[PDB]
Amino acid sequence: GGWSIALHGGAGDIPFSLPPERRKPREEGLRHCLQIGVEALKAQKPPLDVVELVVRELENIEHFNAGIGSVLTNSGTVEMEASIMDGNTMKCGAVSGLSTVLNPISLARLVMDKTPHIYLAFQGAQDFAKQQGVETVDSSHLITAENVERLKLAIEANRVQVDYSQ
Amino acid sequence: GGWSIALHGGAGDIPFSLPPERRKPREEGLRHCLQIGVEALKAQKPPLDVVELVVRELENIEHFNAGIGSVLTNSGTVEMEASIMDGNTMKCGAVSGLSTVLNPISLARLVMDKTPHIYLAFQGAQDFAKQQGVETVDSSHLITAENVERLKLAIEAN
Amino acid sequence: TVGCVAVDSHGNLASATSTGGLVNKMVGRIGDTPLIGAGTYANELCAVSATGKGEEIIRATVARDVAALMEFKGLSLKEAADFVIHERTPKGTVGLIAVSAAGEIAMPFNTTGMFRACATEDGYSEIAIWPTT
Amino acid sequence: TVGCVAVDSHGNLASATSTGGLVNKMVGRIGDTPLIGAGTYANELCAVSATGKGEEIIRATVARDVAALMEFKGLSLKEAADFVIHERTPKGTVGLIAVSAAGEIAMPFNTTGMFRACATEDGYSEIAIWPTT
Numbered sequence A: 001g002g003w004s005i006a007l008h009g010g011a012g013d014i015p016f017s018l019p020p021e022r023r024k025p026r027e028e029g030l031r032h033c034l035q036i037g038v039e040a041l042k043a044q045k046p047p048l049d050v051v052e053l054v055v056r057e058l059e060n061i062e063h064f065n066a067g068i069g070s071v072l073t074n075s076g077t078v079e080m081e082a083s084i085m086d087g088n089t090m091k092c093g094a095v096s097g098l099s100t101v102l103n104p105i106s107l108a109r110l111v112m113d114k115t116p117h118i119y120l121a122f123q124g125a126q127d128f129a130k131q132q133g134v135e136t137v138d139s140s141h142l143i144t145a146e147n148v149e150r151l152k153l154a155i156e157a158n159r160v161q162v163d164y165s166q
Numbered sequence B: 001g002g003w004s005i006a007l008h009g010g011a012g013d014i015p016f017s018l019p020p021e022r023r024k025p026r027e028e029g030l031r032h033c034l035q036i037g038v039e040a041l042k043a044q045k046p047p048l049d050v051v052e053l054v055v056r057e058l059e060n061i062e063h064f065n066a067g068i069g070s071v072l073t074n075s076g077t078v079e080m081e082a083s084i085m086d087g088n089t090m091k092c093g094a095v096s097g098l099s100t101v102l103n104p105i106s107l108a109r110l111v112m113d114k115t116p117h118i119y120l121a122f123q124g125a126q127d128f129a130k131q132q133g134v135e136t137v138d139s140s141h142l143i144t145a146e147n148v149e150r151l152k153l154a155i156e157a158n
Numbered sequence C, D: 001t002v003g004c005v006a007v008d009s010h011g012n013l014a015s016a017t018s019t020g021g022l023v024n025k026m027v028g029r030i031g032d033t034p035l036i037g038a039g040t041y042a043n044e045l046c047a048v049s050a051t052g053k054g055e056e057i058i059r060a061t062v063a064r065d066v067a068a069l070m071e072f073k074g075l076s077l078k079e080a081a082d083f084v085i086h087e088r089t090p091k092g093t094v095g096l097i098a099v100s101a102a103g104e105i106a107m108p109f110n111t112t113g114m115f116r117a118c119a120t121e122d123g124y125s126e127i128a129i130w131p132t133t
């Protein structure tokens, strides 16, 4: 009759032997966020509003590499990026180099609608966030032990790795 | 079979009301770089090498919006960006948010060639530039007084 | 990388993608996620959100190729999605999700696994990690 | 913006684009020029470099589209480049330059002008600003 929705939490090298501690929260994440997307479409929110809603929730799953739970740079810091696109108008919004913005996807939207630009990055994009008043957090709040441990292993191997790496 | 080259120094609203003192150095700019790229192809330099070389020179012309003569931000600052791509390999390079780097396109090539990434930006692009020992000047040297007045005018015009 | 794509009853399509990027990336490194036509794209015909080895997604302009194969060569969502993923990207580097104007859903990937979900108004649901095999 | 596209007699293509962006742009604003697929693209089939309103070029992924039109719909370099510039993009927002694997040159634009120049081994060369007439 009408709506469909899909979502993801990352593509990569995920072993069949992903431990319970690593697997259940991601499986739970997928469900939680899918319930929300479905309910929003059921309540007929515009699809553009729905994808921002679902990604804010995906961003909020600590076990997915976006927002809280973002993987780390070679310097052990956080740099998040996001983009969003309305297929009906071709409008879009994007951001890069966020370190304190709690929900990057929502800044991408804000740039789309409130700026004659599509893409803002690094200091300038934190300036925009400050100006717009979105939620920002101490950088540490974005960091997970799992991610620190991955950096370490990637940093001795001298590799750039996908969150999901053997 | 034969080589071909195309190049530009910007698209937009270019008036019938266009004075020679701004027309001629852009026409000379375009001619100079055509000859630089053509001489490269005649000597059968790789296309990739050739487009960096020509874009490098198009940058060094203060009358085009790139490298020295780049337009200004709302803060009156220079923030430059480039990209380069080889169609036979699909290799790519890009930079953004550069301010002190004389030939951004050459830094975009270096990311391609020396880095596992395609794109670096702002402070981190500038770090990479520094490791690489490329030519940096300080940013006064990139600001033409044509672009300062350009900016002031655009601000009150909004 | 996270993402979500959705379409309503009228064909209104949209896409969103967010990421921390790659582990151990150089500071300042930009991936596919913030680029339009690379990691995120949406259209008259479809919406796409990609994930994996950023650079490999930029190189193949993944999200846009899908839309482009559909409109220009007439491929269905399924065929276009499979084609970009399984024929134009090295293996183990890329997954994507997509929906079409008319409600179709495609979730191909060439990585070992991709955390993904989807649903339709008619009643379908699926959570998944590895390929159905 | 500035750019150059080149090709040798064996159809090895390349593109390079560089700019200071848009006068009075917010600090941190990225345009098309550094986005593979928008401002700059190069293939087996062709090479492209665009220029003008960055935001319109990002949105229309114009460098990729010219290539995509050629491959997927079989259009020539002239037809494809013309479609993107004079159909799928707004007047006064964008110009591009391109070369084909076979040596073909196209330079459409929908702005008042575009500072441009081109040449071939076979002897042709123009430099220009406004449309030819």
Ligand SMILES: [Cl-]
Pocket: C019, C021, C022, C031, C032, C033, C052, C053, C054, C055
């Ligand atoms: Cl990435």
Ligand SMILES: [Cl-]
Pocket: C127, C128, C129, C130, C131
């Ligand atoms: Cl599964």
Ligand SMILES: [Cl-]
Pocket: D019, D021, D022, D031, D032, D052, D053, D054, D055
């Ligand atoms: Cl621009």
Ligand code: NA
Pocket: A058, A059, A060, A061, A062, A063, A064, A065, A066, A067, A068, A069, A070
């Ligand atoms: Na997260």
Ligand code: NA
Pocket: B058, B059, B060, B061, B062, B063, B064, B065, B066, B067, B068, B069, B070
């Ligand atoms: Na210049």
